[PDB]
């Protein structure tokens, strides 16, 4: 356990009472305290889980995200104002940092505090020790679910590498004079190793804040940091899946014959692939027991519902998206049966799958990527909607990148090469006309990848993009393998898309890495 004196080292004073690493039993009682008001208030649902409301703080606040620019980060961070920018990594002065830090420590002074020590990363040799301090019980509950809970033995020798202080109740009145976006703030200081949260009550800021920090620390050590889901087969073969909204990442990574390592954040070190998290933060709009039985069943006592509509009686209305469509629920990973246990990690990945939804109808259902193409497409992070509106998210998670995108690509292929892994580009999209690709076909494609069939298969190249397409695939109509067969014609569309890729990639050509990669992209 820790003493009040330990917290005063951070600037907090007059510490009334500390509840260190509270059990789920205690948190449940705390959340239901009738004296709580506003966003602190918790309500019991018919499913047994507690539900909370974060007001207008429905999602992340990229505009209020700042990182202190100093000797530590000056030359290493991917700044929003240097070179070509193109990101939310806005620099902050050390003096303003001390002011923001002071606002939080003063807000937390003279209160009963909740302190949660946890780990980020499932592999002991490469994990990060994090201490979270909050004055709100459900916030302590959120971090207990989302990060790895230490054993009493691990707690004995705990020494935090990073400290996050949640001061949602305070705001910065001097914001205007300081040249900030608003009175709220999500700030990071890599020299003092701390994260501050002010004004915003959105739980995801704690999850995504640590992800951004891991994205900085790990690649520097030669450890891949990835925004993906990962699962394992009976033979211990592991696959990682990358894909933005609509790509079907989650659904395709759900397989009764394959245990889940994790659904969102993973690292890849000398020992293999590991989950950063100890829980899942799932979206709940239109959630049905029929479509998502695993998630639905995870919602019980100890899970924490966020912003969902609950009626006086009858309770949860998962369909009500009037307030927001970003309704969430967090729960410890063990609420899911089909997982890798007792530790969320496995061996080296041998199959890397990039999922996309090409509404332009140009890309093939499946292509086997070359090492350079893997890097090119990882950096592009393409997907399109409504058909078509294209989206390019670097490394399939641009908003959480702390280093130049090329750095993530380099470490990824380094680990892939050491494992002899193979990458595939799978297009589950439709241009809006004629017969679309069926879920059955999509599953057949994934099976062919996972079982090693496409690994040494004969292929033919697709013009311009130069993608290698397998000659035939078991359980799939050979006809659908060639995207041209759906239609000048395809060529005209291919030129349009190729131009988009080229236009987007110019953002990284300044670096020797990005520059060298241009030759792996579309040739028009």
Swiss-Prot record:
GO biological process assignments: gluconeogenesis
Compartment annotation: Cytoplasm
Taxonomic superkingdom: Bacteria
Cofactor(s) required for function per UniProt: Mn(2+)
Activation and inhibition: Allosterically activated by calcium. It may represent the only case of a monomeric, allosteric enzyme.
Stimuli inducing this protein: Induced upon entry into stationary phase and by cyclic AMP (cAMP). Repressed by glucose (catabolite repression) and by CsrA.
Pathway stated in the Swiss-Prot or TrEMBL entry: Carbohydrate biosynthesis; gluconeogenesis
UniProt keyword terms in alphabetical order: Acetylation, Allosteric enzyme, ATP-binding, Calcium, Cytoplasm, Decarboxylase, Gluconeogenesis, Lyase, Magnesium, Manganese, Metal-binding, Nucleotide-binding
GO cellular component, as recorded: cytosol
Keyword Magnesium: yes
EC main group: lyase
Residues that hold Ca(2+) according to the record: 144-145, 147, 278
Ion transport found in the keyword field: no
Job description of the protein: Involved in the gluconeogenesis. Catalyzes the conversion of oxaloacetate (OAA) to phosphoenolpyruvate (PEP) through direct phosphoryl transfer between the nucleoside triphosphate and OAA.
Similarity remark: Belongs to the phosphoenolpyruvate carboxykinase (ATP) family.
Subunit structure: Monomer.
Name of this protein: Phosphoenolpyruvate carboxykinase (ATP)
Organism annotation: Escherichia coli (strain K12)
């Amino acid at each position: 356990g820790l003493t009040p004196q330990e917290l005063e080292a951070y600037g907090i004073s007059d510490v009334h009472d500390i509840v260190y690493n509270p059990s789920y039993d205690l948190l449940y009682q705390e959340e239901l305290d009738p004296s709580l008001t506003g966003y602190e208030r918790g309500v019991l649902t018919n499913l047994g889980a507690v539900a909370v409301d974060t007001g207008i703080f429905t999602g992340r606040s990229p505009k209020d995200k700042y990182i202190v620019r100093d000797d530590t980060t000056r030359d290493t961070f991917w700044w929003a104002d240097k070179g070509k920018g193109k990101n939310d990594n806005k620099p902050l002065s050390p003096e303003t940092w001390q002011h923001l830090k002071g606002l939080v420590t003063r807000q937390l002074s003279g209160k009963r505090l909740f302190v949660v020590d946890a780990f980020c990363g499932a592999n002991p040799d490469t994990r990060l020790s994090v201490r979270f301090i909050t004055e709100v019980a459900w916030q302590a509950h959120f971090v207990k679910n989302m990060f790895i809970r230490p054993s009493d033995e691990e707690l004995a020798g705990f020494k935090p590498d990073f400290i996050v202080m949640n001061g949602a109740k305070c705001t910065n009145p001097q914001w205007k004079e300081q040249g900030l976006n608003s009175e709220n703030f999500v700030a990071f200081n890599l020299t003092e190793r701390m994260q501050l949260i002010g004004g915003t009550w959105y739980g995801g800021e704690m999850k995504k804040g640590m992800f951004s920090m891991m994205n900085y620390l790990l690649p520097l050590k030669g450890i891949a940091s990835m925004h993906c889901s990962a699962n394992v087969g009976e033979a211990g073969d592991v696959a990682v899946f990358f894909g933005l909204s609509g790509s079907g990442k989650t659904t395709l990574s759900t397989d009764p014959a394959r245990r889940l390592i994790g659904d969102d954040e993973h690292g890849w070190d000398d020992d293999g692939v590991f989950n950063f998290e100890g829980g899942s933060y799932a979206k709940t709009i239109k959630l049905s027991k029929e479509a998502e039985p695993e998630i639905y069943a995870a919602i019980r006592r100890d899970a924490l519902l966020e912003n969902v509509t609950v009626r006086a009686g009858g309770t949860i209305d998962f369909d009500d998206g009037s307030k927001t469509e970003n309704t969430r629920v967090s729960y410890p990973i063990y609420h899911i049966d089909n997982i890798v246990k007792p530790v969320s990690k496995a061996g080296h990945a041998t199959k890397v799958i990039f999922l996309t939804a090409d509404a332009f109808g140009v890309l093939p259902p499946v292509s086997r990527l070359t090492a350079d193409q893997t890097q090119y497409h990882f950096l592009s992070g393409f997907t399109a909607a409504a058909a078509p509106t294209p989206t390019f998210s670097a490394c399939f998670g641009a908003a959480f990148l702390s280093l130049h995108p090329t750095q993530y690509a380099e470490v990824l292929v380094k680990r892939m090469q050491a494992a002899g892994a193979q990458a595939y580009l799978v297009n589950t999209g439709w241009n809006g006309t004629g017969k679309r690709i069926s879920a059955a076909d999509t599953r057949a494609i994934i099976d062919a990848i996972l079982n090693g069939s496409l690994d040494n298969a004969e292929t033919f190249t697709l013009p311009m993009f130069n993608l290698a397409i397998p000659t035939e695939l078991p359980g799939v109509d050979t006809g659908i393998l060639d995207p041209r067969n759906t239609y000048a014609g395809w060529q005209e569309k291919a030129e349009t898309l190729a131009k988009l890729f080229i236009d987007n990639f110019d953002k990284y050509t300044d670096t020797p890495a990005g520059a060298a990669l241009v030759a792996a992209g579309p040739a028009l």
